[PDB]
Amino acid sequence: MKLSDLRPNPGANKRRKRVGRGPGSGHGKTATRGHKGQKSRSGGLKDPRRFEGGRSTTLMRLPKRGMQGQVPGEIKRPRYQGVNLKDLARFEGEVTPELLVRAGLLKKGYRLKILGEGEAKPLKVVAHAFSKSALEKLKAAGGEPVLLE
Amino acid sequence: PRLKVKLVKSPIGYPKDQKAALKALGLRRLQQERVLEDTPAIRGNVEKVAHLVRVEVVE
Amino acid sequence: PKMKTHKGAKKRVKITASGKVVAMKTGKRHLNWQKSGKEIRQKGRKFVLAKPEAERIKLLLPYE
Amino acid sequence: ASEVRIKLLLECTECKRRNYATEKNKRNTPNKLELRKYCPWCRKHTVHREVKI
RNA sequence: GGGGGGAACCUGGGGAACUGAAACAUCUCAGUACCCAGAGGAGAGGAAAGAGAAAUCGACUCCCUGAGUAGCGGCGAGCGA
RNA sequence: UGGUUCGUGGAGCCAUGGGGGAAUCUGGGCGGACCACCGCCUAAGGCUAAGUACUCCGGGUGACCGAUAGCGCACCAGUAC
RNA sequence: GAGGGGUUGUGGCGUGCCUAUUGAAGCAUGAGCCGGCGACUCACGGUCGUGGGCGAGCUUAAGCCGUUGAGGCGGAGGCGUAGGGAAACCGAGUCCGAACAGGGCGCAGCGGCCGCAAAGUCCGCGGCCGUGGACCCGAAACCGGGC
RNA sequence: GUGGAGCCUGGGAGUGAGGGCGCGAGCGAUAACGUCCGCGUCCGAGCGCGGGAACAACCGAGACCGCCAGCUAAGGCCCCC
RNA sequence: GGAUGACCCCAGGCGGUAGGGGAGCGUUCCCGAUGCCGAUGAAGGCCGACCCGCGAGGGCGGCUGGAGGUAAGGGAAGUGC
RNA sequence: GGGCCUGACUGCGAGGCCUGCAAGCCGAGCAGGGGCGAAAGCCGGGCCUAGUGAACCGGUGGUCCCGUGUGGAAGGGCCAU
Ligand SMILES: [Mg+2]
Ligand SMILES: [Mg+2]
Ligand SMILES: [Mg+2]
Ligand SMILES: [Mg+2]
Ligand SMILES: [Mg+2]
Ligand SMILES: [Mg+2]
Ligand SMILES: [Mg+2]
Ligand SMILES: [Mg+2]
Ligand SMILES: [Mg+2]
Ligand SMILES: [Mg+2]
Ligand SMILES: [Mg+2]
Ligand SMILES: [Mg+2]
Ligand SMILES: [Mg+2]
Ligand SMILES: [Mg+2]
Ligand SMILES: [Mg+2]
Ligand SMILES: [Mg+2]
Ligand SMILES: [Mg+2]
Ligand SMILES: [Mg+2]
Ligand SMILES: [Mg+2]
Ligand SMILES: [Mg+2]
Ligand SMILES: [Mg+2]
Ligand SMILES: [Mg+2]
Ligand SMILES: [Mg+2]
Ligand SMILES: [Mg+2]
Ligand SMILES: [Mg+2]
Ligand SMILES: [Mg+2]
Ligand SMILES: [Mg+2]
Ligand SMILES: [Mg+2]
Ligand SMILES: [Mg+2]
Ligand SMILES: [Mg+2]
Ligand SMILES: [Mg+2]
Ligand SMILES: [Mg+2]
Ligand SMILES: [Mg+2]
Ligand SMILES: [Mg+2]
Ligand SMILES: [Mg+2]
Ligand SMILES: [Mg+2]
Ligand SMILES: [Mg+2]
Ligand SMILES: [Mg+2]
Ligand SMILES: [Mg+2]
Ligand SMILES: [Mg+2]
Ligand SMILES: [Mg+2]
Ligand SMILES: [Mg+2]
Ligand SMILES: [Mg+2]
Ligand SMILES: [Mg+2]
Ligand SMILES: [Mg+2]
Ligand SMILES: [Mg+2]
Ligand SMILES: [Mg+2]
Ligand SMILES: [Mg+2]
Ligand SMILES: [Mg+2]
Ligand SMILES: [Mg+2]
Ligand SMILES: [Mg+2]
Ligand SMILES: [Mg+2]
Ligand SMILES: [Mg+2]
Ligand SMILES: [Mg+2]
Ligand SMILES: [Mg+2]
Ligand SMILES: [Mg+2]
Ligand SMILES: [Mg+2]
Ligand SMILES: [Mg+2]
Ligand SMILES: [Mg+2]
Ligand SMILES: [Mg+2]
Ligand SMILES: [Mg+2]
Ligand SMILES: [Mg+2]
Ligand SMILES: [Mg+2]
Ligand SMILES: [Mg+2]
Ligand SMILES: [Mg+2]
Ligand SMILES: [Mg+2]
Ligand SMILES: [Mg+2]
Ligand SMILES: [Mg+2]
Ligand SMILES: [Mg+2]
Ligand SMILES: [Mg+2]
Ligand SMILES: [Mg+2]
Ligand SMILES: [Mg+2]
Ligand SMILES: [Mg+2]
Ligand SMILES: [Mg+2]
Ligand SMILES: [Mg+2]
Ligand SMILES: [Mg+2]
Ligand SMILES: [Mg+2]
Ligand SMILES: [Mg+2]
Ligand SMILES: [Mg+2]
Ligand SMILES: [Mg+2]
Ligand SMILES: [Mg+2]
Ligand SMILES: [Mg+2]
Ligand SMILES: [Mg+2]
Ligand SMILES: [Mg+2]
Ligand SMILES: [Mg+2]
Ligand SMILES: [Mg+2]
Ligand SMILES: [Mg+2]
Ligand SMILES: [Mg+2]
Ligand SMILES: [Mg+2]
Ligand SMILES: [Mg+2]
Ligand SMILES: [Mg+2]
Ligand SMILES: [Mg+2]
Ligand SMILES: [Mg+2]
Ligand SMILES: [Mg+2]
Ligand SMILES: [Mg+2]
Ligand SMILES: [Mg+2]
Ligand SMILES: [Mg+2]
Ligand SMILES: [Mg+2]
Ligand SMILES: [Mg+2]
Ligand SMILES: [Mg+2]
Ligand SMILES: [Mg+2]
Ligand SMILES: [Mg+2]
Ligand SMILES: [Mg+2]
Ligand SMILES: [Mg+2]
Ligand SMILES: [Mg+2]
Ligand SMILES: [Mg+2]
Ligand SMILES: [Mg+2]
Ligand SMILES: [Mg+2]
Ligand SMILES: [Mg+2]
Ligand SMILES: [Mg+2]
Ligand SMILES: [Mg+2]
Ligand SMILES: [Mg+2]
Ligand SMILES: [Mg+2]
Ligand SMILES: [Mg+2]
Ligand SMILES: [Mg+2]
Ligand SMILES: [Mg+2]
Ligand SMILES: [Mg+2]
Ligand SMILES: [Mg+2]
Ligand SMILES: [Mg+2]
Ligand SMILES: [Mg+2]
Ligand SMILES: [Mg+2]
Ligand SMILES: [Mg+2]
Ligand SMILES: [Mg+2]
Ligand SMILES: [Mg+2]
Ligand SMILES: [Mg+2]
Ligand SMILES: [Mg+2]
Ligand SMILES: [Mg+2]
Ligand SMILES: [Mg+2]
Ligand SMILES: [Mg+2]
Ligand SMILES: [Mg+2]
Ligand SMILES: [Mg+2]
Ligand SMILES: [Mg+2]
Ligand SMILES: [Mg+2]
Ligand SMILES: [Mg+2]
Ligand SMILES: [Mg+2]
Ligand SMILES: [Mg+2]
Ligand SMILES: [Mg+2]
Ligand SMILES: [Mg+2]
Ligand SMILES: [Mg+2]
Ligand SMILES: [Mg+2]
Ligand SMILES: [Mg+2]
Ligand SMILES: [Mg+2]
Ligand SMILES: [Mg+2]
Ligand SMILES: [Mg+2]
Ligand SMILES: [Mg+2]
Ligand SMILES: [Mg+2]
Ligand SMILES: [Mg+2]
Ligand SMILES: [Mg+2]
Ligand SMILES: [Mg+2]
Ligand SMILES: [Mg+2]
Ligand SMILES: [Mg+2]
Ligand SMILES: [Mg+2]
Ligand SMILES: [Mg+2]
Ligand SMILES: [Mg+2]
Ligand SMILES: [Mg+2]
Ligand SMILES: [Mg+2]
Ligand SMILES: [Mg+2]
Ligand SMILES: [Mg+2]
Ligand SMILES: [Mg+2]
Ligand SMILES: [Mg+2]
Ligand SMILES: [Mg+2]
Ligand SMILES: [Mg+2]
Ligand SMILES: [Mg+2]
Ligand SMILES: [Mg+2]
Ligand SMILES: [Mg+2]
Ligand SMILES: [Mg+2]
Ligand SMILES: [Mg+2]
Ligand SMILES: [Mg+2]
Ligand SMILES: [Mg+2]
Ligand SMILES: [Mg+2]
Ligand SMILES: [Mg+2]
Ligand SMILES: [Mg+2]
Ligand SMILES: [Mg+2]
Ligand SMILES: [Mg+2]
Ligand SMILES: [Mg+2]
Ligand SMILES: [Mg+2]
Ligand SMILES: [Mg+2]
Ligand SMILES: [Mg+2]
Ligand SMILES: [Mg+2]
Ligand SMILES: [Mg+2]
Ligand SMILES: [Mg+2]
Ligand SMILES: [Mg+2]
Ligand SMILES: [Mg+2]
Ligand SMILES: [Mg+2]
Ligand SMILES: [Mg+2]
Ligand SMILES: [Mg+2]
Ligand SMILES: [Mg+2]
Ligand SMILES: [Mg+2]
Ligand SMILES: [Mg+2]
Ligand SMILES: [Mg+2]
Ligand SMILES: [Mg+2]
Ligand SMILES: [Mg+2]
Ligand SMILES: [Mg+2]
Ligand SMILES: [Mg+2]
Ligand SMILES: [Mg+2]
Ligand SMILES: [Mg+2]
Ligand SMILES: [Mg+2]
Ligand SMILES: [Mg+2]
Ligand SMILES: [Mg+2]
Ligand SMILES: [Mg+2]
Ligand SMILES: [Mg+2]
Ligand SMILES: [Mg+2]
Ligand SMILES: [Mg+2]
Ligand SMILES: [Mg+2]
Ligand SMILES: [Mg+2]
Ligand SMILES: [Mg+2]
Ligand SMILES: [Mg+2]
Ligand SMILES: [Mg+2]
Ligand SMILES: [Zn+2]
């Protein structure tokens, strides 16, 4: 298995489309741009995700809703990330917020809330919050809901 | 996990406390299945009346 | 450079779980005295935007 | 609407919350509208009275 | 002791417009281009009358990240900690 | 008025052209109008390496150019004109 | 040297090229001819597709160490694992509502524990979009500082 | 009715100056190689081929390549032919 | 069919501007390469009625030229007028 | 024409018409609390089709959802206009 056997899988390394390179390519002359107009030009059109020919745009006629916020910005308040009991199945004995951030299910700076999707296990579960159903489940299954603050 | 306990042999002729264990499991009929939880208090009775039940380990 | 979120879209619209774009019905900001309760009520609910327009607004929200 | 045909709010006289918007020709109906409407706060019908919009 | 010079870099004092906003004035371009003064092999900054919510941190500078987030905005175009 | 993300906005903070104008710790500034509570910090003197920027200069190295290319100049080029 | 090359008398047929156009040999544009130069790119971000890695996870950035065309370390952070709600909040739900009503937006692999595939994510490649001058050439102009 | 049919989902477009002709009308003057719609067609993109003297769109007919073979379409069969 | 484009039989499609898609050719450069072709002649030039390829092209031969060129397979672009 | 009245409902809304979007349109049924009727029932303005104006920005009533260390407040949001 030498350097000359080193191939990429078919279609792994596709060739590029080259336009403006003559009649036989299918891309000659106008470079697949059409004939004239703003789109054919170098620099092209206004952003098609928004600009709509001058009329009030689809997005701009929709109304706003909700609190957008004021300076000095976001209010610092406790943030809760939910974690379903199903995602606790892998653990043994004790689960804390720290273990859940290592395992990759809970995000740092987020307070822990257990949610009831899945089946509870006889684990000790230290969390900042428990849903009505997650609490009920975790009791029935011989778990120890440890409430934090 | 969970338990699916099925009463397969009759308590008739077994001691009162093995009879009571089925009462604690909710097993009243032969071949009656109940999908219980898997806790040591619920598991202790199942081990008591092991010879009468047939346990499934549904999750 | 990295694309910037369009804040008009962010402030008007929400990308639902399955990728739908939901917004507030237009037409009840003002001029409501002569509008049937049916009109005021139904215009207070959210609607799902038409596919083409939903797909343009989603591109404006590249970090939701 | 016009200057003679004003827009107005109907106000539940019991809890005072404006619950309905409508109109009236105040040349033909100068006195305040009194009308029994269902008040969603009182959850019952109520003398609603005309109030300035 | 000063003077003057030095490619680019740096700080300070001043400071556009085309352009973008598919017109345009706020806005943008941009405190950019450019002018000027000064510095130096760098320059600035620097040892909390700070941060801002951690009962926390501990000068400054610089990179990554936070984050195109928080916000700002004819709440438009965009700007952006 | 400027700076800040903050375009007057509930607009604080930092700076300051004008007017008014304190106190020395039981003094004062700050935590985004403001008030209270609770904290944080010590203004109106100065200096301070290093980490950072640049490349006239020397060297090293290119899936960089190879004389219409590569610097405007491979050559008596900022020349001839 | 039963073939081929060069030439062209006669006969048949026959309206340059490019561009622009509804339509050009067109008496519409461009080109005297030749040689060289000459126009869809790159970065970051996005989106979709695709080739692999791994998979309820995936991945590092700056740096640090090594190398001197050697790679590794680095988990800060990023995306995903949950949504609904303006939000407080609740959460496989949530929002509206008096509702246990109705509705909106949401919520569940193939084979005999093993493979197979996979959410997702990372990297490569490709198309296209965004930001840059963004396919190349071209104004008339505007502004600054000088002459 | 298996068709370069249709349907769903997604990537990429280009086009958004049409024109002739037949028919249906409107406008015009029961004018226009006029104009504006409707249905169809062709040209556009079939300025490739046959006919129509020549001639995008009338008739004939949808050109993958080769043949010093055959049959036809329109139109033709006195000579040009 | 046979088994997976191994090639063969049958059938059908194959005008085309904008434009979509697919497959290729060639140019410069990197790995392959401390290799290999090369003065018994590199590249480049000029011929060829020869061979291969639908084609872009690739061979081959003669002349010129006088020192470089660079395979299979991949990689990257200042890539074709 | 007359009697009683306020359904010129609140919360919704199956299903559609229309339609590039955004809009526009019709709507049975369920719940709340009503109106008329003996009742069946009818009533979510008007025989019907015009009587209209997306967003942004702000006003007012409600709500009591956010409140920048905390409690308040400023200011927002939400419902209605
Ligand atoms: Mg490539
Ligand atoms: Mg590309
Ligand atoms: Mg291709
Ligand atoms: Mg190419
Ligand atoms: Mg070509
Ligand atoms: Mg193509
Ligand atoms: Mg084409
Ligand atoms: Mg051309
Ligand atoms: Mg194209
Ligand atoms: Mg393309
Ligand atoms: Mg294009
Ligand atoms: Mg054209
Ligand atoms: Mg065109
Ligand atoms: Mg052109
Ligand atoms: Mg055109
Ligand atoms: Mg044009
Ligand atoms: Mg075009
Ligand atoms: Mg240009
Ligand atoms: Mg342009
Ligand atoms: Mg307009
Ligand atoms: Mg926000
Ligand atoms: Mg701040
Ligand atoms: Mg325990
Ligand atoms: Mg027995
Ligand atoms: Mg017995
Ligand atoms: Mg006993
Ligand atoms: Mg906005
Ligand atoms: Mg509205
Ligand atoms: Mg409103
Ligand atoms: Mg309002
Ligand atoms: Mg009305
Ligand atoms: Mg109504
Ligand atoms: Mg009303
Ligand atoms: Mg309502
Ligand atoms: Mg993010
Ligand atoms: Mg001096
Ligand atoms: Mg001087
Ligand atoms: Mg000096
Ligand atoms: Mg300055
Ligand atoms: Mg300056
Ligand atoms: Mg000036
Ligand atoms: Mg300007
Ligand atoms: Mg610009
Ligand atoms: Mg732009
Ligand atoms: Mg402009
Ligand atoms: Mg413009
Ligand atoms: Mg102008
Ligand atoms: Mg500026
Ligand atoms: Mg400069
Ligand atoms: Mg000075
Ligand atoms: Mg000096
Ligand atoms: Mg230094
Ligand atoms: Mg210094
Ligand atoms: Mg200093
Ligand atoms: Mg000090
Ligand atoms: Mg983040
Ligand atoms: Mg981020
Ligand atoms: Mg700025
Ligand atoms: Mg001031
Ligand atoms: Mg200010
Ligand atoms: Mg300002
Ligand atoms: Mg404001
Ligand atoms: Mg301010
Ligand atoms: Mg001050
Ligand atoms: Mg002052
Ligand atoms: Mg003190
Ligand atoms: Mg004091
Ligand atoms: Mg102060
Ligand atoms: Mg102050
Ligand atoms: Mg203060
Ligand atoms: Mg503070
Ligand atoms: Mg405060
Ligand atoms: Mg104090
Ligand atoms: Mg402090
Ligand atoms: Mg120094
Ligand atoms: Mg030192
Ligand atoms: Mg230093
Ligand atoms: Mg350096
Ligand atoms: Mg550099
Ligand atoms: Mg050098
Ligand atoms: Mg070269
Ligand atoms: Mg060389
Ligand atoms: Mg030369
Ligand atoms: Mg030169
Ligand atoms: Mg030469
Ligand atoms: Mg030189
Ligand atoms: Mg020269
Ligand atoms: Mg000379
Ligand atoms: Mg011969
Ligand atoms: Mg001959
Ligand atoms: Mg001839
Ligand atoms: Mg003949
Ligand atoms: Mg002709
Ligand atoms: Mg040609
Ligand atoms: Mg033209
Ligand atoms: Mg013309
Ligand atoms: Mg001619
Ligand atoms: Mg001529
Ligand atoms: Mg002319
Ligand atoms: Mg000509
Ligand atoms: Mg012209
Ligand atoms: Mg031309
Ligand atoms: Mg000439
Ligand atoms: Mg010639
Ligand atoms: Mg040439
Ligand atoms: Mg491109
Ligand atoms: Mg480039
Ligand atoms: Mg790119
Ligand atoms: Mg991409
Ligand atoms: Mg990818
Ligand atoms: Mg992997
Ligand atoms: Mg080495
Ligand atoms: Mg997530
Ligand atoms: Mg949310
Ligand atoms: Mg509510
Ligand atoms: Mg629901
Ligand atoms: Mg549903
Ligand atoms: Mg896999
Ligand atoms: Mg994958
Ligand atoms: Mg695109
Ligand atoms: Mg640029
Ligand atoms: Mg460009
Ligand atoms: Mg581009
Ligand atoms: Mg002039
Ligand atoms: Mg001007
Ligand atoms: Mg001017
Ligand atoms: Mg002027
Ligand atoms: Mg001047
Ligand atoms: Mg077809
Ligand atoms: Mg088709
Ligand atoms: Mg494409
Ligand atoms: Mg287009
Ligand atoms: Mg077009
Ligand atoms: Mg047009
Ligand atoms: Mg025209
Ligand atoms: Mg047109
Ligand atoms: Mg027409
Ligand atoms: Mg026309
Ligand atoms: Mg047509
Ligand atoms: Mg006709
Ligand atoms: Mg006829
Ligand atoms: Mg006709
Ligand atoms: Mg007509
Ligand atoms: Mg006549
Ligand atoms: Mg005509
Ligand atoms: Mg006619
Ligand atoms: Mg006519
Ligand atoms: Mg036609
Ligand atoms: Mg055309
Ligand atoms: Mg034809
Ligand atoms: Mg055709
Ligand atoms: Mg023809
Ligand atoms: Mg023709
Ligand atoms: Mg012919
Ligand atoms: Mg003919
Ligand atoms: Mg003909
Ligand atoms: Mg003839
Ligand atoms: Mg004609
Ligand atoms: Mg015959
Ligand atoms: Mg005949
Ligand atoms: Mg004849
Ligand atoms: Mg005959
Ligand atoms: Mg004859
Ligand atoms: Mg055919
Ligand atoms: Mg074809
Ligand atoms: Mg294909
Ligand atoms: Mg080539
Ligand atoms: Mg090639
Ligand atoms: Mg090289
Ligand atoms: Mg080598
Ligand atoms: Mg070699
Ligand atoms: Mg040799
Ligand atoms: Mg030789
Ligand atoms: Mg070469
Ligand atoms: Mg050849
Ligand atoms: Mg040779
Ligand atoms: Mg020789
Ligand atoms: Mg050599
Ligand atoms: Mg090679
Ligand atoms: Mg190769
Ligand atoms: Mg290789
Ligand atoms: Mg080029
Ligand atoms: Mg009547
Ligand atoms: Mg009456
Ligand atoms: Mg009546
Ligand atoms: Mg009564
Ligand atoms: Mg519906
Ligand atoms: Mg619609
Ligand atoms: Mg209408
Ligand atoms: Mg009732
Ligand atoms: Mg009733
Ligand atoms: Mg009822
Ligand atoms: Mg009754
Ligand atoms: Mg009734
Ligand atoms: Mg009804
Ligand atoms: Mg009406
Ligand atoms: Mg009536
Ligand atoms: Mg509006
Ligand atoms: Mg606006
Ligand atoms: Mg407002
Ligand atoms: Mg509150
Ligand atoms: Mg509170
Ligand atoms: Mg507070
Ligand atoms: Mg108090
Ligand atoms: Mg109070
Ligand atoms: Mg308030
Ligand atoms: Mg309010
Ligand atoms: Mg409203
Ligand atoms: Zn009331």
Distant-in-sequence, close-in-space partners of B23: CB < 8 Å, separation ≥ 6: none
CB atoms within 10 A of CB C41: 11
Task: List Cα–Cα distances, D14 to A102, D9, D10, D11, in angstroms.
Answer: 59, 15, 12, 9
Q: D 1-53 residues with CB below 8 A of C? A: 1, 7-8, 21-23, 53
Cβ contact B21:B48 at 8 Å? yes
Show the tokens assigned to C31.
């001029």
Q: Which residues of C touch D8 (CB under 8 A)?
A: 33
Rounded CA gap, C50 and C18, in Å? Answer: 15
Q: B8: domain CATH number?
A: 3.30.1390.20
Show the tokens assigned to D37.
């409407």
Show the tokens assigned to A115.
């949610």
Rounded CA gap, A100 and A84, in Å? Answer: 11
Q: C 10-39 residues with CB below 8 A of D? A: 32-34
Integer-rounded Cα Rg, in Å, for chain A is: 29
Q: Which residues surround ligand 181, an ion (CB under 5 A)?
A: A 3, 6
Rounded CA gap, D39 and D11, in Å? Answer: 9
Report which DSSP code applies to A32.
Answer: T
User: Sheet harboring B53-56: ordered strands across?
Assistant: B33-37, B2-7, B53-56
**D44-52 and D5-12: which strand pairing?**
antiparallel
Q: Which domain holds residue B37?
A: 1-59
Distant-in-sequence, close-in-space partners of B56: CB < 8 Å, separation ≥ 6: B3, B4, B5, B6, B33
Handedness of CA A36, A42, A47, A51 (dihedral sign): negative
Torsion angle in degrees (nearest 10) through CA of A61, A65, A69, A70:
60
Which structural technique was applied? X-ray
Contact between chains at A121 and B39 (C-beta distance less than 8 A): no
Rounded CA gap, D50 and D23, in Å? Answer: 10
**B2-7 and A129-130: which strand pairing?**
unpaired
Q: Ligand 92 centre and the CA of C20: distance in Å? A: 74
- Residue A89: φ, ψ to 5°: -55, -30
Rounded CA gap, C62 and C58, in Å? Answer: 7
Rounded CA gap, A13 and A8, in Å? Answer: 7
Beta bridge partners, C48, equal: C22
- The reply to whether A6 Cβ lies less than 7 angstroms from strand F is no
Query: Phi-psi bin for A43: left (phi > 0), alpha (psi -120 to 50), beta?
Result: left
Q: How many structural domains compose chain B?
A: 1
List, as one string, the DSSP characters of C34-53.
TS-HHHHHHTTSEEEPPHHH
D19: Cα within 13 Å, side-chain hemisphere: 22
